[PDB]
Amino acid sequence: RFLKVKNWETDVVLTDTLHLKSTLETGCTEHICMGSIMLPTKDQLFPLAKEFLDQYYSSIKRFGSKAHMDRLEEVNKEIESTSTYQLKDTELIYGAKHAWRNASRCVGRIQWSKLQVFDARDCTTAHGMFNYICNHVKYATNKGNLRSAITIFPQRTDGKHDFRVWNSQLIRYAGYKQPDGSTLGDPANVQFTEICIQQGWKAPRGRFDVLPLLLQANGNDPELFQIPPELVLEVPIRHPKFDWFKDLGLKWYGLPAVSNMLLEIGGLEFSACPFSGWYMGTEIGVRDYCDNSRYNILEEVAKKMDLDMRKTSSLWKDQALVEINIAVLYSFQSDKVTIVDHHSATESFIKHMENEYRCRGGCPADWVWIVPPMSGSITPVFHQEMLNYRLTPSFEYQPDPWNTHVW
């Protein structure tokens, strides 16, 4: 029950013990592995609080202290009375950093302890949320010198007063259907783009229309807000070699900020907690441009390269996929916007793994998601065995609000 993981490129073997602290379930069983599947009261709550507080006071080398037992009793009494409890700032910051630390699918976690936590638990309105989000975006962006951050809105109470950011990301481009049949803008967002228009948004109808924010406070109806353009840093996409690349009329936003997940800490549920870092190149160029259910500009690009698109055997898709990705990195780098390539990030992650096996006894990791979506086997994480398990605090999926929210 003390598990080894082997890197088959270097024969380096790490032993995992951290997994024995895992609580939540994987979805797998002895007879079936689900590793490639996308998605997975008062009595319940106090063990959850205790587990969290126990790891907190251990991490500050005050396990078993009067401070520890006092805090434990304090929360216990607050629960039995108020049927919930509140985190101290220290615990709030610790929890958020560790939800990222434990995010098994994230290749970026070497940075995990350098996270800026914004406490928005005093927030009461959509307008308020807009202010907090604007401040988040501006701080994180930092004129291209991106900084990781999370903003945390009030915890769930009874599921009727949830704070929700309805956008999947704070910054994303609109996608509109054409009567012609195809898709203008960005196809991933077509339903949300409709919802916004369905909610009173005036669509500029371009390719790169920044979506409005659709914020829900205290469980009320959500509200549209237009992010100040001056806060949305964008990079024009050009190629260092192909001058015709500029002509394609492509750009992307510098700030990846996922806003639809739920942050769980010591049993408490933060349904609104937008968090952001900086892009790995492939997230935009491999997925956001070349996925079939996305921009799918591959064909167009290959044409301009005058590649033989008659047989798949020419690997024209591959060749084009590469140039596109060379351009993304070039464009961001030239504009002094933070970006990391997939070789650098994966090299960092292997180092981070070594650190976590060393100082923590392991590191939950989801190979299916850690391996970049291109050039997989020439990155060091490919030949790296990984163990995937669920630690807490954590980021979780949650239903789309429009499937739930009673209007």
Ligand X SMILES: CNCc1cc(C#N)cc(OCc2ccc3c(C)cc(N)nc3c2)c1
Binding residues, as ranges, are 36, 106, 169, 278-279, 283, 368-369, 382, 397
Q: Considering the rule CB under 6 A, would residue 325 count as an interface residue with ligand X?
A: no
- Enumerate the known binding-site residues for heme b: 106, 397
Active-site position among 71, 101, 106, 164: 106
Among 117, 214, 280, 350, binds ligand X (CB under 6 A): 280
Output the residue with the shortest Cβ distance to Zn ion. Answer: 33
Residue 321 binds a copy of itself, judged by CB under 8 A: yes
List the catalytic residue out of 100, 112, 166, 278: 278
| Region of 72-80, 121-129, 164-172, 381-389 interacting with a copy of itself (CB under 8 A) | 381-389
Known active-site residue 109 = yes
Q: Which residues precede chain breaks (C–N over 2.5 Å) in the chain?
A: 40
Distance (Å, whole) CA 176 – CA 161: 32
Which tokens sit at 47? 């063990």
Site for ligand H4B in 359-398 (CB under 6 A): 368-369, 382-385
Q: Does 28 help bind Zn ion (rule: CB under 5 A)?
A: yes
Burial status of residue 273 (CB atoms within 10 A of its CB: 0-12, 13-18, 19 or more): buried
- The CA distance from 297 to 291, in Å, is 9
Annotate 271-286 with three-state secondary structure: CCCCEECCCEHHHHHH
Annotated binding site for L-arginine: 169, 278-279, 283
Enter the DSSP assignment of 92: H
- Which token pair is 44? 């319940």
Q: Residues 370 to 399: which contact ligand HEM by CB under 6 A?
A: 395
Backbone angles phi, psi at 178, to 5 degrees: -105, 145
Taking only Cα atoms into account, the Rg of the chain, rounded to an integer number of angstroms, comes to 23
The listed partner (a copy of itself, ligand HEM, ligand X, none) that binds 304, CB under 5 to 8 Å by sort, is: none
Amino acid type, 246: K
By C-beta, is 283 or 356 nearer to ligand X? 283
* Distance of alpha carbon 106 from alpha carbon 346, whole angstroms: 10
What's the token pair of residue 192? Answer: 């949300």
345-374 residues in contact with a copy of itself (CB under 8 A) are: 366-368, 371-374
Q: Which of residues 111-150 bind ligand H4B (CB under 6 A)?
A: none
Enumerate binding residues for ligand HEM (CB under 6 A). 100, 103, 105-108, 111, 115, 148, 150, 275, 277-278, 280, 283, 340, 345, 369, 395
Catalytic residues: 106, 109, 278, 283
